[PDB]
């Protein structure tokens, strides 16, 4: 009767971590009902005062965000609400670094977390080659097009006109316009087919880095802006093999059991068994070091240096848990 339940203040002991790298996002979802996307938008809204800056009721919003969380799959791995939860929160903490303090208005952070929230919604637990070489309707819908990356932004917009789901009624037209285009730009940029282009152009953007008298650096443009909102919320899609090594191996275990599904599924049916999909000739730890040699480790190092020093301890971390699963291979 006005005061938390015994569960509710442990859970708020533990978003008591929001702001750091390596909180207990797992716990998390067990200590709110598995409602991880909800209590973690919600803690970073406040915090950020995004409801008193974008005039969101608060009812509109939580109505938002469980509806939200309830269209992830829970029978679903790696790609369900506990990634969503991961990926804002890991944006969130990027979003603070040192380098980037004052860069970027309130709508552009808006739109990177609304982003991450929304990014792999409705994810079904395969491939979009899966569903290209399947002929299934996404595939068809999307006409094979990063299918499933206009498939997660399709349904995160569409579920703002659900009941009391409008947490952007009170946007003029002008911000409601400049939202949705971030938005669509940032996780059209999840689809990993973009990941090379991403890489290059933030290369170009260290390689050319101008700073203010601030000390933090100058985004003058909207395709310089928007590239590292892209390349920040890409970082945090890709952050798993960052954090502790608790926390990694969990993730590791659900995107194998999401992949050797996939790759039942294509073996029941004599497709070709796709990269890392076939259980029975799969090495767990070798495709570990190759994620982190061929993809995680060139992108995050790019990242620190674009945000340098701020990112040394993930990129320690990075480092130490590549040598950890280097030294399991037999
Ligand atoms: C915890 O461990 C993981 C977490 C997520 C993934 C993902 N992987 N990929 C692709 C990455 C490239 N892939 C590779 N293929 C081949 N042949 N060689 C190689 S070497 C280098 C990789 C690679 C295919 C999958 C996705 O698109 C997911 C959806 C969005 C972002 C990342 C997600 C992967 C993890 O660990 C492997
Ligand atoms: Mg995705």
């Given at each position: 009767?006005?005061?938390?339940?015994?569960?509710?203040?442990?859970?708020?002991?533990?978003?008591?971590?929001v702001?750091?790298?390596?909180?207990?996002?797992?716990?998390?979802?067990?200590?709110?009902?598995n409602?991880?996307l909800?209590?973690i938008?919600?803690?970073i809204?406040?915090?950020?005062?995004?409801?008193?800056?974008?005039?969101?009721?608060?009812?509109?919003?939580?109505?938002?965000l469980?509806?939200?969380?309830?269209?992830?799959h829970?029978?679903?791995?790696?790609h369900?609400?506990?990634?969503?939860?991961?990926?804002?929160?890991?944006?969130?903490?990027?979003?603070?670094?040192?380098?980037?303090?004052?860069?970027?208005?309130?709508?552009?952070?808006?739109?990177?977390?609304?982003?991450?929230?929304?990014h792999?919604?409705?994810?079904?637990g395969?491939?979009?080659q899966?569903?290209?070489?399947?002929?299934?309707?996404?595939?068809?819908?999307?006409?094979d097009s990063?299918?499933?990356?206009?498939?997660?932004?399709?349904?995160?917009?569409?579920?703002?006109?659900?009941?009391?789901?409008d947490?952007?009624?009170?946007?003029?037209k002008?911000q409601?316009?400049?939202?949705?285009?971030?938005?669509?730009?940032?996780?059209?940029a999840?689809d990993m087919?973009?990941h090379?282009n991403?890489?290059?152009?933030?290369?170009?953007?260290?390689?050319?880095k101008?700073?203010?008298?601030?000390?933090?650096?100058?985004?003058?443009?909207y395709?310089?802006?928007?590239?590292?909102?892209?390349?920040?919320?890409?970082?945090?899609?890709?952050?798993?093999?960052?954090?502790?090594?608790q926390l990694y191996?969990?993730?590791?275990?659900?995107?194998?059991?999401?992949?050797?599904r996939?790759?039942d599924r294509?073996?029941?049916?004599?497709?070709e068994?796709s990269?890392?999909?076939?259980?029975?000739?799969?090495?767990?730890?070798?495709?570990?070091?190759?994620?982190?040699?061929?993809?995680?480790?060139?992108?995050?190092?790019?990242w620190?240096?674009?945000?340098?020093?701020?990112?040394?301890d993930?990129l320690?971390?990075?480092?130490?848990n590549?040598?950890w699963y280097?030294?399991?291979?037999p």
């Amino acid at each position: 009767f006005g005061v938390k339940t015994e569960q509710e203040d442990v859970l708020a002991k533990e978003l008591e971590d929001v702001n750091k790298w390596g909180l207990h996002v797992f716990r998390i979802a067990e200590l709110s009902g598995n409602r991880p996307l909800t209590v973690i938008m919600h803690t970073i809204f406040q915090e950020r005062d995004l409801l008193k800056t974008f005039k969101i009721p608060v009812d509109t919003l939580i109505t938002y965000l469980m509806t939200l969380e309830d269209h992830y799959h829970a029978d679903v791995a790696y790609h369900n609400n506990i990634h969503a939860a991961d990926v804002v929160q890991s944006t969130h903490v990027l979003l603070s670094t040192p380098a980037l303090e004052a860069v970027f208005t309130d709508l552009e952070i808006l739109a990177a977390i609304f982003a991450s929230a929304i990014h792999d919604v409705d994810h079904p637990g395969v491939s979009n080659q899966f569903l290209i070489n399947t002929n299934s309707e996404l595939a068809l819908m999307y006409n094979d097009s990063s299918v499933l990356e206009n498939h997660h932004l399709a349904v995160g917009f569409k579920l703002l006109q659900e009941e009391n789901c409008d947490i952007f009624q009170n946007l003029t037209k002008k911000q409601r316009q400049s939202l949705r285009k971030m938005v669509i730009d940032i996780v059209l940029a999840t689809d990993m087919s973009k990941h090379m282009n991403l890489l290059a152009d933030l290369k170009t953007m260290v390689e050319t880095k101008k700073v203010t008298s601030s000390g933090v650096l100058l985004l003058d443009n909207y395709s310089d802006r928007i590239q590292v909102l892209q390349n920040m919320v890409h970082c945090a899609d890709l952050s798993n093999p960052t954090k502790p090594l608790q926390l990694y191996r969990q993730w590791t275990d659900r995107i194998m059991e999401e992949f050797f599904r996939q790759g039942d599924r294509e073996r029941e049916r004599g497709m070709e068994i796709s990269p890392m999909c076939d259980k029975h000739n799969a090495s767990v730890e070798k495709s570990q070091v190759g994620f982190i040699d061929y993809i995680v480790h060139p992108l995050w190092e790019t990242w620190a240096d674009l945000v340098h020093p701020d990112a040394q301890d993930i990129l320690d971390t990075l480092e130490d848990n590549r040598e950890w699963y280097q030294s399991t291979i037999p």
